[PDB]
Automatic annotation (TrEMBL), chain A:
Pathway linked to the protein: One-carbon metabolism; tetrahydrofolate interconversion
Function: Interconversion of serine and glycine.
Domain Serine hydroxymethyltransferase-like, chain residue ranges per copy: 15-394
InterPro entries found in the cross-reference section: PyrdxlP-dep_Trfase, PyrdxlP-dep_Trfase_major, PyrdxlP-dep_Trfase_small, Ser_HO-MeTrfase, Ser_HO-MeTrfase-like, Ser_HO-MeTrfase_PLP_BS, SHMT-like_dom
GO molecular function (one): glycine hydroxymethyltransferase activity
UniProt-recorded name of the protein: Serine hydroxymethyltransferase
Automatic annotation (TrEMBL), chain B:
Extent of the signal sequence: none
Enzyme class: transferase
Protein's recorded name: Serine hydroxymethyltransferase
Organism listed in the record: Glycine max
Function: Interconversion of serine and glycine.
Residue span, Serine hydroxymethyltransferase-like domain: 15-392
Length: 454, 452, 451, 451
């Protein structure tokens, strides 16, 4: 009849209001620190970020335009957003006269689409790596591909394809490319065909901020990013855009027209307001990302991926491009006669989380031939090159086990699956993974206070 | 030289890692519980939802397809999303054989655009209330239907006549400033007459819908979308509900037709989810949907409606004019044109008095103000408190009119009477004294940094 | 074997090379003589036009831009130059304010090149009863404006209200079955209020327009398209007229603004003429346009309008209902609903009686559209159109009888259309009537089927 | 009052319009007193011209395929039905396997109606040398495939990779200047491996195809479109062939009929405002009857032998041909080895009554396109096409001299063309050589402008 008291519904902890969800989060906390997390797009963010994320900021509606009022109901939100904006420019070593940033998109993908909406008309032609996204529904997409021999982006064919196809936009960035990007060559191709040049640096934005990979800002018109990957932030989106005078190519005294179009495109995608708690949490992560500690983290992420890749190749496994210059290694399993799904499935049963991933020369996108392995998340748990060699040995045992099950039971998934049940070798591997994982600290929550202990 | 230990960067609380951001959040925490929050799209959600939001779920990648693995890496998020889905159907009294729900969209707006992508091709015709800017207007062909220019109600006849002429593939109902309920039956008849899909964006009133305090869109609409932080009192997140199973008897329809939304909506959402959903939103939303299904939430929803009614009765008793002369939901739309005031003038002055409202068009610069009850109600306010809010609103517009009668109707001229104004300072102080009397969900006023 | 010599395949007349087709054309020549041709879009063009249509012009390729060279195109260019200048002269247009492109194959592709030249794909278009789902409704975004459902006149206030809400980039005026003139001024005011281009498809009334017997669209429209075989009495061919030169004073228009239609229309037409225009249509149209500028053509246009009025006054005197209760142009829209007869029933009964009309929707199509241009061209005047009025009255009287003795269902009604002496008598009466009028375009003295 | 009907309507063109009469007579002379090497041109038959210029131009029909055979459409429907059955017969098509729509005004609108029937807007299309500015590139997403840059043959491997990356909904084959036959087998392979419909626009060689002198696209394509005036030697008109009946064995295909017919007819009908050109359909029926004649087969074979023989002659003088010769009606002459633009050769040939088309070779056009169909219809044979070869050799020779004596920029180069006795001498031999040959379509003996 009457309402519940505010203290009952509104101030009672999750543990009491919703024991089922609380119990599942606790089980997920334990999962995160009792296995080996090699999903290349995942990180373990800081408690500070998580605290800004889960705060009263989730209550605040704001318009979806860059705030400037700095008074009234938006006084503190506007200040938080101003901090997010400047810390963003600062993290990527950008001059505010030449670069602006919008931190309002909910996530990377709506940020990308808002950017496409700002600068393109519907059906405009777009080229990206292996490019069904809204990108491909509402625009005319055509992929460029890696060189069949080297695994690097085939820049000559990129230029020939762009000249034949005439894209209004060329997208840099990938999810599974283990090398850096020749943004200069991309600029040259884009200039030869009249295209805008945008980088989606989602995966390596943390390496970018740490100046451990080439900066797309040197040559790209627009740079978008999701913020939770190597950046180690909340799940949020950002759009960087050039400001001021255009380099010459073009009418006299041309200035970039990106700012208003992008702000309006984002604004019009933000019905009900942005996630101001994400902006607040992103501000915290951008501060942490500008620190000397974060530069060292980013060097360790690269060093860790290199050391895992050296361990794997030393056992005779094949890496796409024969190594890595970033946070991940792409492992080609075709020379073993294995599918990425099989290795991913058996790894998962041992609490090692990887992603099956297509490799060049795959027949069907239904059966990818590789696995993708990233270092950000376990590096954040404090792992260094030697720990990543142990991870290599865990992976070596998992793939070895996968070969044995396949050879014993068959390559058809139905037959392959027979070797996964009551398999002591799997159970032994899984136990070793848990003992190893349990050796490391965990950011974002206190393992000491977890509900499910060892 | 070496990495910071996990302890240092990773478990240190926000107050030490980032005092500036910690401070601004504390100031914002004070603003939320020391003023009068009438933004119709705002709520104050529960501490429990916030604890789920701010948890290790933010680290978990998932593919962006409805989870069914229940083993391995996704074991626990699959269970969480599964509870979110089932609790969603329960909160809105839906039978799983008839209705499915997708809880993966980041927010309401990409939830809507994914719904449109699933069932429409580019350039298909759409009509909505005041639908033009938005991606909806850019990639589809949109024509607005409108409210009757004298009653403020939706003109159902002109809607039918536009629909018959324009032939939309999709008709959208739901809106942000319409103070009445929706004749969804009529919308269904109009949609059936022209062959349109019928979609409700129930964002603002989903709380009342789940509590069965307003008309259920689900009776008549093919798809219902929602943002979950307004009347529903959840996190900021999105859901897409869609019909499943046999389509109703319809002339010329192929025999044994079944709805085909599920796969199309699932693929469109998945293709909009690069890097995965916000699994912390899904967990926080499963907490809100459990709270929405409580007996206390039905009573919250009745109270929201009663509070809006009673604030409206107070305003009209003072001779103010409300669009349609009352409300059937959580808001009141205040027509300020007979006062010779613009909505921005009241919004501005109110803002300076810690009363947050929204200028809003009525029936080009908006001549009205939208005022919502869900936020203040959530702090426990009842009708008599909304009459006190009414009196605060009455003082603010009285002062607004005084400023305009002394300094002028032009904007720069009006902005003068807003500096060093004792009436403003008196209202502000009184609003704060009043606001400090009420409980506040989500955090503990007691443990706040900036105390009274 | 070897090739037939040129003379055997290439110079032998049609009557020998293809007797079946020859006989078919001769039977059709006879059908055209021995019936009352009331299809409002038809005419009987001149032998001179036909002689230029069927000439060696059909062999000539030209690149498909307005010929300006006057070489291998020396003569086709001069023919086209005459065609353009006669086009301007026939419609009383200053060659400094108007240009005309005469290369489109027909009216439809002319309109679509016009749209292609001034609009982007999916741009919004409004036309009369504009949805047959044409390229206009598929590649652009179309929305009809309509006639007042009670008076049958165009509802100019709903038009404006619809255009303010829909915001067309292009408003098309002109119709196939509208029996009144067009307030182009009001159309311009509506188009100006909503930022729309204004185009008139004057296909049906172009002959009346040239003779200045109806309002001229050129006073107010940006573009004017037309097919040339209707009231204009020419070959089947298309033309696009467009404003050129400085734009006239317009609120919110930059000073010294110019029209920019010419090169976009030319390129759009050129891009649509794969393998070149139909230069025999251009020569034939040149002839028709010369004929349309004559004092005889003005009197013919007056007579077309007098004839449609006289027919309308006759049918109304028998108690029939016409949409808008009359006509101001070449046609009459007969509302058959007060009688319980469908357009198809009246249309089929007339067709059996050698009277060719078209079922037409009115404010199953419940009306018939009847036009005066074709019979007027055989020399018929008002008294002769009143006799057509009587033939039409008899045939609807006979249709109402078949439905009254056999039923309003189609299969039930077709019964009465079998071995009906009344139909046979009406058919013979129409035939004896029609046979006595002259026939342009060929010599009845040389026909194969003179009886 | 109105003119008497006979005065405006039955008088001949020479009386009504002496200006246009004169121009057509001059053009008739230009056609029989020059060398006409436009590969898209032919000289159609008098019999075709008589059906083209007939009372058929007066008849309105709906634009749906005709089936009435009674009343107003009695004879038109019979003409159309003959046209359709003769079209199928001219290309040896089982009427259960193939349908044909004969009402498009011309080739280009036939193509667009085809695309409108089977494509949605923005669907991807691939064709040879396509753009990304026809209505095709404007309303669909087009990407070209190209010929091997060094050999000039279609690069079928790059065609395959391009189609697999681009995923067209429609692949178009056919070309305007490709001097070789088409591997339709390969094209159907490529289309199946990428899910595409396969359309052939056979405009240029449909004459060769009907006579089975080149590969039949009907073996491998879903839809075949054509204009009818080229090698087919008919009227300027268009034709859409579409498959009917059982679909061929496909992997995930229900146990499925072709679905083109109703979609094609509706698209064409929706493009036919005011009705088809029924005189074109009549004239086309004549052309198809003539195409299925044993002499037409001899004509087709002769067109190729003339193209070949002119190729071998120019090649034996040192000139380079794209692909080193021809398998059809044209040769494409690569003039880049001479430092001559196509325009410079076309210009000088034109001053000599030799009409050729500058053409882009494998960025001003680097060669010229030469066709055989037109002069082969005037009866010319191999020895004569070698004489053209010699005329052409003299033209290029004289052109090279002017470029040496005056320069490469047209401004300077042009001075060589003034007061050029060699040019004048060549024109006379051209004209004298032309006068030796018959001409179809009109009697040379009866022209106004005699020798």
């Amino acid at each position: 009849s009457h309402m519940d008291p505010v203290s009952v519904w509104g101030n009672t902890p999750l543990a009491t209001v919703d024991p089922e969800i609380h119990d599942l989060i606790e089980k997920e906390k334990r999962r995160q620190c009792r296995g080996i997390e090699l999903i290349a797009s995942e990180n373990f963010t800081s408690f500070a970020v998580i605290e800004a994320l889960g705060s009263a900021l989730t209550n605040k509606y704001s318009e979806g335009m860059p705030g400037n009022r700095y008074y009234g109901g938006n006084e503190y939100i506007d200040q938080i957003e101003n901090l997010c904006r400047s810390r963003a420019l600062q993290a990527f070593h950008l001059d505010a006269q030449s670069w602006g940033v919008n931190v309002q998109p909910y996530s990377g993908s709506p940020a990308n689409f808002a950017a496409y909406t700002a600068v393109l008309n519907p059906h405009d032609r777009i080229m990206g790596l292996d490019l069904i996204s809204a990108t491909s529904i509402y625009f005319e997409s055509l992929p460029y591909k890696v060189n069949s021999t080297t695994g690097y982006i085939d820049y000559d064919r990129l230029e020939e394809k762009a000249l034949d196809f005439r894209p209004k936009l060329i997208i840099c960035g990938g999810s599974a490319y283990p090398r850096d990007w020749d943004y200069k060559r991309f600029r040259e191709v884009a200039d030869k065909c009249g295209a805008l040049l945008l980088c989606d640096m989602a995966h390596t934005s943390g390496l970018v901020a740490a100046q451990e990979v080439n900066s797309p800002f040197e040559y790209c018109d627009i740079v978008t990013t999701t913020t939770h990957k190597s950046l180690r932030g909340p799940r949020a989106g950002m759009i960087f855009y050039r400001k001021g005078p255009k380099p010459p190519k073009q009418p006299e005294n041309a200035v970039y027209d990106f700012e208003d179009k992008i702000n309006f495109a984002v604004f019009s995608s933000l019905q009900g307001g942005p996630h101001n708690h994400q902006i607040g949490a992103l501000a915290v992560a951008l501060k942490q990302a500008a620190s000397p500690g974060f530069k060292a983290y980013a060097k360790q992420v690269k060093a860790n991926a290199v050391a895992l890749g050296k361990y794997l190749m030393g056992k005779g496994y094949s890496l796409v491009t024969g190594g890595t210059e970033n946070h991940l290694v792409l492992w080609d399993l075709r020379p073993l006669g294995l599918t990425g799904y099989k290795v991913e499935k058996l790894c998962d049963l041992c609490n090692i989380t990887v992603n099956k991933n297509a490799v060049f020369g795959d027949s069907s996108a239904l059966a990818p031939g590789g696995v993708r392995i990233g270092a950000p998340a376990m590096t954040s748990r404090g792992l260094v090159e030697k720990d990543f060699e142990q991870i290599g040995e865990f992976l070596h045992r998992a793939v070895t086990l996968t070969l044995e099950i396949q050879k014993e039971h068959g390559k058809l998934l139905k037959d392959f699956n027979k070797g996964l049940v009551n398999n002591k070798a799997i159970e032994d591997l899984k136990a070793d993974v848990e003992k190893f994982s349990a050796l490391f600290d965990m950011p974002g929550f206190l393992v000491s206070e977890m509900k499910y202990k060892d």
